[PDB]
Amino acid sequence: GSGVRGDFGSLAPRVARQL
């Protein structure tokens, strides 16, 4: 229920103006 959809592979975000 409280999982998280996505495909194998971990990664982070990629901002420029944000922290």
Side-chain angles (χ1 to χ4, degrees):
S2 265
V4 263
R5 64 200 144 178
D7 254 8
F8 54 84
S10 277
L11 76 113
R14 192 93 225 172
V15 336
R17 332 211 227 83
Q18 251 219 100
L19 285 152

